[PDB]
Amino acid sequence: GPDQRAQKKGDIILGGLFPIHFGVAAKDQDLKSRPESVECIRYNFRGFRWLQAMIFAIEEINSSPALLPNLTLGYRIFDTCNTVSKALEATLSFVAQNKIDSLIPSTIAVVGATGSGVSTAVANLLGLFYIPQVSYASSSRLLSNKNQFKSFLRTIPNDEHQATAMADIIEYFRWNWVGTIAADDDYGRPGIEKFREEAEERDICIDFSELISQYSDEEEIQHVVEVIQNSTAKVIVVFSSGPDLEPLIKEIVRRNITGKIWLASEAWASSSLIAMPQYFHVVGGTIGFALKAGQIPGFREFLKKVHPRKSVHNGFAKEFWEETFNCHLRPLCTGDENISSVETPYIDYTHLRISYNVYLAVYSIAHALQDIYTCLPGRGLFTNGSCADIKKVEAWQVLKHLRHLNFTNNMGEQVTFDECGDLVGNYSIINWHLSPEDGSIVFKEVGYYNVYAKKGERLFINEEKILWSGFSREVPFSNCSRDCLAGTRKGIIEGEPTCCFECVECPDGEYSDETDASACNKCPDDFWSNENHTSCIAKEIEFLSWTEPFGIALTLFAVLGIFLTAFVLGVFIKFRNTPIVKATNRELSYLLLFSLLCCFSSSLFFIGEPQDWTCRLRQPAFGISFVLCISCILVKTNRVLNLQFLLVFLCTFMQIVICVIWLYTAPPSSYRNQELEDEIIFITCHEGSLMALGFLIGYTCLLAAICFFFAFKSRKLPENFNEAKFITFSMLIFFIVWISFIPAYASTYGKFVSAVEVIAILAASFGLLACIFFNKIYIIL
Amino acid sequence: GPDQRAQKKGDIILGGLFPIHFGVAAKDQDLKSRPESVECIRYNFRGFRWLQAMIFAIEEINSSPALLPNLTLGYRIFDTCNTVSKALEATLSFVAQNKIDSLIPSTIAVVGATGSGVSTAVANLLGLFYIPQVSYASSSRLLSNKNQFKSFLRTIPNDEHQATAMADIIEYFRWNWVGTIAADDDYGRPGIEKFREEAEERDICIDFSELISQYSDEEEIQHVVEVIQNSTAKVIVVFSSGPDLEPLIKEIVRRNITGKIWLASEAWASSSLIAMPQYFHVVGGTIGFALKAGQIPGFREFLKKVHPRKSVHNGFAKEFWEETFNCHLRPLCTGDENISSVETPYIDYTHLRISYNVYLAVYSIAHALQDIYTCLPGRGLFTNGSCADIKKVEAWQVLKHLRHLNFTNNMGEQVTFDECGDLVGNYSIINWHLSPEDGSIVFKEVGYYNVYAKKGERLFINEEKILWSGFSREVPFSNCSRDCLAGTRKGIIEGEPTCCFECVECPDGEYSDETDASACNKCPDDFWSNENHTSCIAKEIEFLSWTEPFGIALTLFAVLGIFLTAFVLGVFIKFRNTPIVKATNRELSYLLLFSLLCCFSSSLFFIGEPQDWTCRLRQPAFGISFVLCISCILVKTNRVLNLQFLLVFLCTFMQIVICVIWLYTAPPSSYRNQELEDEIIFITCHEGSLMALGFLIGYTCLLAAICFFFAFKSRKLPENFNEAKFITFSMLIFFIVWISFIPAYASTYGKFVSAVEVIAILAASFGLLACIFFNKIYIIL
Ligand SMILES: *[C@@H]1O[C@H](CO)[C@@H](O[C@@H]2O[C@H](CO)[C@@H](O)[C@H](O)[C@H]2NC(C)=O)[C@H](O)[C@H]1NC(C)=O
Ligand SMILES: *[C@@H]1O[C@H](CO)[C@@H](O[C@@H]2O[C@H](CO)[C@@H](O)[C@H](O)[C@H]2NC(C)=O)[C@H](O)[C@H]1NC(C)=O
Ligand SMILES: *[C@@H]1O[C@H](CO)[C@@H](O[C@@H]2O[C@H](CO)[C@@H](O)[C@H](O)[C@H]2NC(C)=O)[C@H](O)[C@H]1NC(C)=O
Ligand SMILES: *[C@@H]1O[C@H](CO)[C@@H](O[C@@H]2O[C@H](CO)[C@@H](O)[C@H](O)[C@H]2NC(C)=O)[C@H](O)[C@H]1NC(C)=O
Ligand SMILES: CC(C)CCC[C@@H](C)[C@H]1CC[C@H]2[C@@H]3CC=C4C[C@@H](O)CC[C@]4(C)[C@H]3CC[C@]12C
Ligand SMILES: CC(C)CCC[C@@H](C)[C@H]1CC[C@H]2[C@@H]3CC=C4C[C@@H](O)CC[C@]4(C)[C@H]3CC[C@]12C
Ligand SMILES: CC(C)CCC[C@@H](C)[C@H]1CC[C@H]2[C@@H]3CC=C4C[C@@H](O)CC[C@]4(C)[C@H]3CC[C@]12C
Ligand SMILES: CC(C)CCC[C@@H](C)[C@H]1CC[C@H]2[C@@H]3CC=C4C[C@@H](O)CC[C@]4(C)[C@H]3CC[C@]12C
Ligand SMILES: CC(C)CCC[C@@H](C)[C@H]1CC[C@H]2[C@@H]3CC=C4C[C@@H](O)CC[C@]4(C)[C@H]3CC[C@]12C
Ligand SMILES: CC(C)CCC[C@@H](C)[C@H]1CC[C@H]2[C@@H]3CC=C4C[C@@H](O)CC[C@]4(C)[C@H]3CC[C@]12C
Ligand SMILES: CC(C)CCC[C@@H](C)[C@H]1CC[C@H]2[C@@H]3CC=C4C[C@@H](O)CC[C@]4(C)[C@H]3CC[C@]12C
Ligand SMILES: CC(C)CCC[C@@H](C)[C@H]1CC[C@H]2[C@@H]3CC=C4C[C@@H](O)CC[C@]4(C)[C@H]3CC[C@]12C
Ligand SMILES: O=C(O)[C@@H]1Cc2c([nH]c3ccccc23)CN1
Ligand SMILES: O=C(O)[C@@H]1Cc2c([nH]c3ccccc23)CN1
Ligand SMILES: *[C@@H]1O[C@H](CO)[C@@H](O)[C@H](O)[C@H]1NC(C)=O
Ligand SMILES: *[C@@H]1O[C@H](CO)[C@@H](O)[C@H](O)[C@H]1NC(C)=O
Ligand SMILES: [Ca+2]
Ligand SMILES: [Ca+2]
Ligand SMILES: [Ca+2]
Ligand SMILES: [Ca+2]
Ligand SMILES: [Ca+2]
Ligand SMILES: [Ca+2]
Ligand SMILES: [Ca+2]
Ligand SMILES: [Ca+2]
């Protein structure tokens, strides 16, 4: 394998894969000459701390007599540089003894790798030989496939819960308009696809989806940046590692794009490549996920005990020293430098999260080996309950014991893998703040995600600790469209997602009292829409009311007419013996005055709220009363020109025959017209039989015409103080009144028609009463 | 490597990876004993034909002295069983000489593999050693990444064009409501993601997205089947291979789900696992993609020459013979069996598509080796133009020459790889029909996809050759909602994609003349929507027209009044010497008759379409004329009770002053009311100054009342044939006819108000003319 390595000799050997470098020298191999090994460039102190965690765990296990007594653990650890090719060279180094036996110490298990693509490439080769591989950082769901990867286990949780938690965080702050950026690898794509599913189930619309890489060209990065600029969405879900996101962040910083809310996956939410003060105007206020911190007592002292000369087994200490103090062993360095003097991620960490995963992977392998070592002969997991010989143990036996592993931590937590080889765990939710004292980016814990909880209760966030964009205390707005107010409704914008809608006000008569209403609700039959359609109010009912001032005036005039009729009748009764009262027919005068009273009472019927019987008794009453009065006048004229009572009764009987017939066949009824005006319901009467009203008015007018003619023939005659002329005047007044109001008798419905009717009745009755009796009263004085 | 193999010795050795079996035995070991090599189970005749294509191409290259003279090509071909593990054992066999030199013949290049995941796993290891690998079937876009895969090339096109073509096919048949099923591997997921991007670009909504595998459990297959059943989408885009889709198709056949329109990716559009007659009630009428067929002359004879004993280099011939004739060497078989007698995919093919790809991969390697062999010393591709020694050639040199390869086919087509190592090519579009003679599934070509064309013109389909669901000539319906007709618009269904909309009819006064109208267009100011709301028509304009029968009657009465006035005037003029004409003032009689003519002419003004000047000259004309006539009557009464002309001129001067004043300050103007009724515009007049009309009517009525009183004081006087009584009658007629029509003078606008106005004017004028002149005419007779 590669010359630079960390090796210790032992009975049982653990392989190790760590990213001591962030990547390799990015250059296209010309193939002009023999291609030499690609060089790793940028030093990764956090990865070196992870390697030190593996070495520390192995040394701790060796020193403890409790775990694996009389057996020494060795390691062979190589640098992957986050690259598949280096990892595969190291893995070929791991499987040499198996390759010899398929077509150098034996490797019983491997710790690593970090990246999911690297782990997948390694796991193909390792599961070929059934060598167990416990990864500390690779969290792709693709590695949960136990058909493809027979010997892969994880001390890190799967990525599915992280994508679901990202969706839950988006839902918590009431966002539905977000963007997605993913690394174009086995980490980014599966996570972003799970997020897309969990967002579409939550009615969250994703504006854009882009893929990036550390090897993305200038044109591709420009395209992604310009896609971000053209978007209105300010919440961008980025599911990537640090190296894969660094070119995009650098370009966005160079363009000074601000105001975006970055939701970070665990792989970069704590990355020193991205969390730099000079990027804070772009990436400040990032909300991201972190793993559960763990404690390794004595680990920091072990880290501080590093030295090029003293660490002979660890061959990566030389470059660590050279890159720490910027020395060579560029000024020469003695080796007396102090680790505590330099600001690097090596010692200057707050929580051990992936380091604890490395520690747990080593201890899981150690506990599987201990379970092999302490196997009682008849209680084994193998054929017939047999147990493996720890002196001649094979990798598949360790894998079998790992699939059944269940051991207690140093922290008192049960570590066990499921069928998919996954270790479930909580998430912490962190926010990127700026340190006032130091100016560096500080990761403040603002919440957690409890994967052990039932759906809907897993997410907890304390928003008072969140500073949006690094400085703001107001939750930002990340919806495509503003909500549609009450009084409006949503309308579709063609070619755009459901989240993007236009606001269209409700039509007349339809109310929408809910903000963001899909459609405008219609109002019931008797209601009409509010002014702004934010509610609707009952329709106003319209008729001729008693309390109304106009109705009051009409009722006042009706009662005045009744008073005048009663006054005339009383004058006639008290002074009937006078020759003037004797000259005219006293009985017929009484009957005429009673008829006038009935006519005024019938005029009172039209006023008021219509009812079925009221509409039944308005026209018949007036018709009968007026025919009665006209008949009394007619018989008085016939006297002027016993039997008189016969004629008046005949005419009134005819009229009541019409009235009874058309009340029996088709009675008038009150109906509430809603077609005249939308806002107002006009409560009016329905005739039932129009030809019946025709017969009513025709008979009344025919008797009127007969009396008119008979009085006209003898108008000059001076009998009863020329009563014939006054009778003609009264009849002609009746005709004037009922001719005058012809246009208003129909069409103009509502209170106007009833008002015109009662006014016509009052005018006709007053004219008749005056022309008949005012001259006689004047004579009496 | 594996014992079962195809090896031939030679100077330059080609590796080979083929799926001689469809998969591996379902032996999931509990790891109780040492795990033995997993065995492959279902024989794959098409894969054996592909292997034979490789061997045949090598044999022609060896036999032909034109290509690679004096150099013999050897092969080492292993079976992958579509499995990463077997392919990696074979690839470790390929890289043994490099592994010895990194920590058995040398392999200069490898042909394979079929699956994209298998090819990816192989390519990691091969590009580690810079060994070129030319795949014949793996089409994942992930393999185009030349950072991850340094030595991978393809004789098969990429999958991006096929996903775009799937989207174009969906667009062509006007579908927006489709489902997606993908294999959960490096083939299915990238293809389905590209399809999702191209579909969302085209506003196609995807109802469901499911992932399947040959190892999918019963519960997962049940979930996918029930998701398909709950969906209304009938077009399902499936981007998978045969083995990965077989369990789902079997389950769907068991439930007998029909009516689905399967869009097939190339990997299964020609698969014998899926294209089975017993599945045709489910998968009949499938529309899928095929590669471009190629011709290999003499290949079929070579296939027919297969024999267990004769084919000593090909070790897969034994199992091919045993599976073909169901014998062993289960009855014993001599070996005299005839290949042509058995119906297998081996000989019974129609087109060579992947076989031609295998042939082209072998010839691409051969032409790269020829370019190395014929390199002129100063024109090489290596350092300083140097050339590689073909006797001591290395794999990286062959890879370098492959990246620059450009050679002519046996069919006269240029084969060259781009920077990504891709070989672009056309697609054919095929439909799954049932054979009437045989009952097997027949792949009929129904179109093509020309990737060399510009976007929008790549797809060609002849729908006449397509039988939907295998038997139907009608394009099926795959939209979420029916289109919204003209007179309707679209409305949002909450929680659902844009493709799923409700149809809501347009509001009153709004029209949508387009199907699938997003919103209802409002109509212009003078238009209103029809009952269907499919368009809107001009509003009816309403006034009192001359042509109208009622207007005709009014004009007839006006002209009759003018005729009567002219008749009276002529009688007076011709017979002025008679004592009755001399008794009344002849000059004042002429002036009064002229005033009556002016009044009738003013009554003519109200009739007709209103205009600014017409509304200016309706009321003033009547007012002035009526003041003329009233003043003439008044001075004639004053005679009854020079200066007469002075008094009439004074009154008419007051009238003309008021008219001039209110015409100068605020003239009446024609206005088009739209607030009375939505459907109808009412063209009427606007007074301008209401108090001006009040003063006008007040002055007219005041002069009228003065004349009334003066005539009442001398009503009994017998002068001029009791003319004072008739003057009182005329003035009373004026008052009553103007009182009678009071309610109609306002509110009831439109033609009704003008009609009532002209009727009032005619009634007043007729009454005045009659009461003045009819007595004198009767005396004259
Ligand atoms: C952004 O859009 C979302 C989804 O439409 C809004 O969330 C809904 O808001 C309404 C009214 O506040 C609630 O009745 C719903 O229950 C919410 N749905 C959820 C939370 O899933 C959110 O209010 C919008 N934010 C804005 C407009 O600032
Ligand atoms: C995951 O997080 C939850 C919530 O923080 C943890 O549940 C808490 O457990 C402590 C005891 O250690 C209780 O005092 C709290 O009341 C619990 N909070 C809840 C239930 O909301 C849970 O223990 C965590 N799991 C792991 C493995 O760390
Ligand atoms: C299914 O829905 C699609 C939506 O695109 C319809 O296609 C549109 O149809 C309208 C008809 O007025 C055309 O104007 C558009 O140009 C079409 N667009 C596309 C992209 O094709 C399609 O007609 C619908 N099919 C039905 C209802 O059977
Ligand atoms: C891809 O398909 C197109 C269309 O079928 C091919 O273009 C045709 O080329 C032939 C000549 O070989 C012409 O006769 C046709 O008229 C062309 N059809 C067109 C332009 O629509 C094209 O040659 C094919 N390319 C390959 C590499 O097969
Ligand atoms: C209701 C109106 C519109 C239509 C019916 C009008 C009829 C009934 C009225 C209106 C005018 C009335 C006429 C007025 C004048 C006279 C002349 C007199 O010597 C006999 C009666 C007679 C002939 C009246 C008969 C009835 C009459 C014709
Ligand atoms: C329009 C309706 C409601 C009211 C009409 C009022 C009518 C009916 C009343 C009011 C004034 C009355 C007139 C007063 C004076 C006279 C003069 C006399 O020699 C004949 C009767 C006559 C002509 C009366 C006829 C009827 C009359 C015109
Ligand atoms: C009864 C006698 C003494 C007088 C008759 C006067 C008559 C002819 C006139 C004078 C005032 C007029 C009213 C004035 C106001 C209105 C309100 C309108 O929306 C309906 C018509 C109505 C109700 C009119 C009816 C007819 C009316 C009452
Ligand atoms: C229609 C409504 C307004 C009622 C109108 C009442 C009018 C028309 C009636 C009631 C009293 C009547 C008057 C009663 C007394 C006389 C005196 C007589 O020598 C001439 C007729 C004359 C002057 C009558 C004219 C008409 C008259 C005024
Ligand atoms: C403007 C609208 C409301 C019409 C107004 C009607 C007025 C102006 C009319 C109608 C009835 C008329 C009155 C009828 C009766 C008489 C009594 C007589 O001895 C003098 C004239 C006099 C007093 C008239 C004056 C004018 C008069 C009051
Ligand atoms: C409502 C309008 C349009 C028409 C009204 C009809 C008027 C104008 C006409 C028609 C019949 C006429 C009446 C006919 C008979 C008489 C009796 C006489 O001794 C006094 C005049 C008097 C009372 C007339 C008054 C005016 C009169 C009522
Ligand atoms: C002068 C002569 C004609 C007598 C006058 C008769 C008057 C009082 C009556 C008889 C018939 C009536 C008309 C009948 C029809 C209508 C149509 C209606 O939508 C408006 C009112 C209107 C236009 C009426 C106006 C008044 C009217 C003309
Ligand atoms: C305005 C519409 C209704 C026309 C009204 C015409 C009426 C009111 C006028 C026109 C002609 C007039 C008649 C002309 C002649 C005479 C004869 C005289 O000895 C008595 C009056 C009497 C009978 C008049 C009564 C009223 C009268 C009928
Ligand atoms: O699976 C993967 O690729 C990522 C790699 C990764 C995770 N967390 C990290 C922290 C630092 C560096 C790398 C990582 C989570 N899993
Ligand atoms: O990349 C892949 O996985 C698929 C495999 C494949 C294709 N076409 C085929 C025909 C038969 C068998 C397998 C295949 C296209 N590429
Ligand atoms: C692991 O052991 C603990 C007790 O030591 C037990 O509670 C737990 O159920 C065990 N886990 C499994 C998966 O059996
Ligand atoms: C390949 O060679 C042919 C000559 O047969 C030439 O026409 C063609 O342009 C060449 N292709 C490239 C990409 O140079
Ligand atoms: Ca120990
Ligand atoms: Ca790594
Ligand atoms: Ca990082
Ligand atoms: Ca769009
Ligand atoms: Ca040759
Ligand atoms: Ca294969
Ligand atoms: Ca197949
Ligand atoms: Ca939904």
Swiss-Prot record, chains A, B:
The chain crosses the membrane at residues 549-574, 587-606, 613-636, 643-665, 690-709, 726-748, 753-774. This is Extracellular calcium-sensing receptor. Changing E542K: In HYPOC1; there is a significant leftward shift in the concentration response curves for the effects of extracellular calcium on both intracellular calcium mobilization and MAPK activity. Changing S139A: Abolished calcium-induced G-protein-coupled receptor activity. Disulfide bonds join C40-C81, C205-C499, C327-C333, C375-C387, C480-C500, C484-C503, C506-C520, C523-C536. Changing A90T: In HHC1; decreased G-protein coupled receptor signaling pathway. The lineage of its organism: Eukaryota, Metazoa, Chordata, Craniata, Vertebrata. It is found in: Cell membrane. Changing I742W: Increased activation by positive allosteric modulators. Spermine binds at D207, S209. Ubiquitinated by RNF19A; which induces proteasomal degradation. One of its GO terms (biological process) is cellular response to peptide. The gene is CASR. One of its GO terms (molecular function) is integrin binding. Residues 480-550 are annotated as: Cysteine-rich (CR). Residues 158-293 are annotated as: Ligand-binding 2 (LB2). Changing R403Q: In HHC1; loss-of-function mutation; the quantity of the mutant receptor is higher than that of the wild-type receptor; dose-response curves show that the mutation significantly reduces the sensitivity of the receptor to extracellular calcium concentrations. Its main location: membrane. Residues 575-586 are annotated as: Intracellular loop 1 (ICL1). Keywords: Calcium, Cell membrane, Disease variant, Disulfide bond, Epilepsy, G-protein coupled receptor, Glycoprotein, Membrane, Metal-binding, Phosphoprotein, Receptor, Signal, Transducer, Transmembrane, Transmembrane helix, Ubl conjugation. Residues 2-157 are annotated as: Ligand-binding 1 (LB1). Changing T383A: In HHC1; likely benign. Changing Q397R: In HHC1; decreased G-protein coupled receptor signaling pathway; does not affect cell membrane localization.
